[PDB]
Design a protein around this ligand. Structure first.
Ligand SMILES: [Cl-]
Ligand SMILES: [Cl-]
Ligand SMILES: [Cl-]
Ligand SMILES: [Cl-]
Ligand SMILES: [Cl-]
Ligand SMILES: [Cl-]
Ligand SMILES: [Cl-]
Ligand SMILES: [Cl-]
Ligand SMILES: [Cl-]
Ligand SMILES: [Cl-]
Ligand SMILES: [Cl-]
Ligand SMILES: [Cl-]
Ligand SMILES: [Cl-]
Ligand SMILES: [Cl-]
Ligand SMILES: [Cl-]
Lengths: 120, 210, 211, 118
């Protein structure tokens, strides 16, 4: 069955760097588009970034444009999100999300367990 | 973001809708999906491409959209359905995915109630410790969904505000407290501070001064 | 009820245990079962008949019992396991099923912190309205599990006390506030009132008086 | 698949009465024993009652002994809990729970219903 496990979430001071790692299982990783969705404490879902099946086109949220680098390793079925120059507004939990359609739509079948990232 | 009601509710067995409206940029020319999240867990996709329902999703669920507005519809309310609901769609202007504010859904087990706002000034002890903190108390409100705002004089306060997610009380009415932490000098300087509570479009406000 | 720790926690990928201990009329005679509840939802049976796992429960789960105590153990800790865990067993004395106090499980994403207790006396405005209410404020504590107590002088007050479930702060440190509804006669009469906060076995107390 | 739906919960003043209804699906109702488990707001799980497969034996918790009447309609795969002379301590959520074999093992739980007394 499909499985999505995130890791790397921890506590750091503002401006520090962090690397998130997401591992997939049960489905062709290189076939679908992936994404990162984040939820601030006591706040709604917020959108972070997507990377296409090939890894050819990456879209970032306006709040994190030019700060985070999203990447994928289809050979190892692993997803990375490199977070640089972190601010305190980035504090929250981070999810790994699959996508079933072509990838231009916001439809995500399976979500990861998530990791909580705290910055103060 | 996309406009969603903070709280929507209905009696057990009724049919309710959640409205998601945004801009011509997003929903109008794209599709809107719906996610259901139980607090502290990963969300789940419950309606995709507007009117299509994923396998495992009850027949009672149904989706529709018209122009720049969308709505998810549930019939036959049940206890199980109570969760946070989000709407999402692709935005070409933003060139990304945009989510709604979030709608907490609760099935009414009792009549709607208004919050009891009691705003507290700083206690002498903490002022003796050169640390001044303020506390607003919200209680006896149902359903458990609120929006809090802190204003210093007539200017809203942007930082230092913490709010606890609503919790149930021994009488199944929700309660929560929001607090502001300051420096004693900040508290002395300003003329007054306000705590603003918003419940289903009806808002209560209380104000105190040193 | 069964005595189980209110809070237990561990680091990602570690193995932690929840201890459930009861009387001889309880665990010793018949088997103990374990339930996992995500907050505000129905529980799920995760360990039944001491060491048996229902279908769909991860292999890392394991259960055990020794004499009059039983311990559920989880390994390869994941965020998925964040919940409240309960132990249950048939008790012959009560001739019924008895549940544990409840154990909140949290994956440590930051170091443990002590609570900042600031007790507030009733605000002048509401006392003018014949309503006296007090608020104890707990903040910047991690993990999000606490036990609250309200005492008048050295006599504990058991009723009229409400407590909010801990909620996360913009810094993923938990915060909650217990409050008590008093009439002005109650507030004025008694000399003082105390708020007691218990975090991981360490207890703090603060007191206020009208003066 | 197995299904459990509870109903009848509402708002009532103390000393009043209420009837809870639980409907089962996906398994032979008359084969297993059923139960009621309740959770007060901000409190741990609490045990209410069980009723045997046939309905021959009823067990109640010490807190509700002689106050509640548990019953079942195996013909309609429906479970009832009659609540009489309610106190304010009875406020909470109420669950429907199936049983796998006089034991505390419950396979499937209901959504729950809110019972409020003030
Ligand atoms: Cl699957
Ligand atoms: Cl698949
Ligand atoms: Cl929360
Ligand atoms: Cl871009
Ligand atoms: Cl591959
Ligand atoms: Cl339809
Ligand atoms: Cl200022
Ligand atoms: Cl005991
Ligand atoms: Cl709730
Ligand atoms: Cl609850
Ligand atoms: Cl084992
Ligand atoms: Cl064994
Ligand atoms: Cl302190
Ligand atoms: Cl409570
Ligand atoms: Cl099933």
């Amino acid at each position: 069955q499909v499985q999505l496990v995130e890791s790397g979430g921890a506590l750091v001071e503002p401006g520090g760097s962090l690397r998130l790692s997401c591992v997939a299982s049960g489905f062709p990783f290189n076939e679908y588009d992936m994404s990162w969705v984040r939820q601030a404490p006591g706040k709604g879902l917020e959108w972070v970034s997507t990377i296409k099946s090939d890894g050819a086109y990456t879209y970032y949220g306006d709040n994190v444009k030019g700060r985070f680098t999203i990447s994928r390793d289809n050979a190892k079925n692993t997803l990375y999100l490199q977070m640089n120059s972190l601010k305190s507004e980035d504090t929250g939990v981070y999810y790994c999300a699959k996508e079933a359609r072509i990838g231009v739509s916001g439809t995500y079948d399976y979500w990861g367990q998530g990791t909580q990232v705290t910055v103060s | 973001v996309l406009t969603q009601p903070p709280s929507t509710s209905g009696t057990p067995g009724q049919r309710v809708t959640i409205s998601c409206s945004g801009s011509s940029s997003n929903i109008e020319t794209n599709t809107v999906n719906w996610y259901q999240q139980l607090p502290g867990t990963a969300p789940k996709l419950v309606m995709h491409t507007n009117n299509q329902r994923p396998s495992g999703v009850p027949d009672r669920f149904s989706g529709s959209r018209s122009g720049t507005s969308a709505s998810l519809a549930i019939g036959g309310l049940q206890s199980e359905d109570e969760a946070d609901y989000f709407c999402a769609a692709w935005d070409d202007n933003l060139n990304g995915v945009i989510f709604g504010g979030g709608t907490k859904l609760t099935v009414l087990g009792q009549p709607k109630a208004a919050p009891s706002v009691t705003l507290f000034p700083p206690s002498s002890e903490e002022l003796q410790a050169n640390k001044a903190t303020l506390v607003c108390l919200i209680s006896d409100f149902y359903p458990g969904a609120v929006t809090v705002a802190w204003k210093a004089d007539s200017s809203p306060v942007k930082a230092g505000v913490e709010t606890t997610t609503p919790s149930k009380q021994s009488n199944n009415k929700y309660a929560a407290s929001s607090y502001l932490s300051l420096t004693p000098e900040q508290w002395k300087s300003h003329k007054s501070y306000s705590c603003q509570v918003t419940h289903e479009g009806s808002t209560v406000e209380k104000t105190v001064a040193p």
